[PDB]
């Protein structure tokens, strides 16, 4: 949600909406304004926690602007096919690999 908080990684109602009304607009708009697979669909394969129903978008976020390092990040905004803000996710204890949630996700 509207501030969000990845573990340490703090992100404010700023940050949050950067980043979600960024894929909002370029994910399915008529681009990809993206590195290559972010923004991209939300994979399927160890389907995390999401509200609402989907399919998503990811975004990896960074403390301070969009389009970023995607894999590493290990902090990553993902929104709903539209522009619903579906929560965050973030590899910050994952051993580069176990995705934990953010903002009251687990």
Do not use: L, M, W
Not at 22 to 35: E, L, P
Not at 100 to 106: A, Y
Request: aromatic share 12%.
């Amino acid at each position: 949600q509207s501030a969000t908080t990845c573990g340490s990684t703090n992100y404010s109602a700023s940050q949050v909406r950067a980043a979600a009304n960024a894929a909002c607009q370029y994910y399915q708009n008529d681009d990809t304004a993206g590195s290559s697979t972010y923004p991209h669909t939300y994979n399927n394969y160890e389907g995390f926690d999401f509200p609402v129903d989907g399919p998503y978008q990811e975004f990896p976020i960074k403390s301070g602007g969009v389009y970023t390092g995607g894999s590493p990040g290990a902090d990553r905004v993902v929104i709903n096919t539209n522009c619903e803000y579906a929560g965050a996710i973030t590899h910050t204890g994952a051993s580069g690999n176990n995705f934990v949630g953010c903002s009251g996700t687990n």
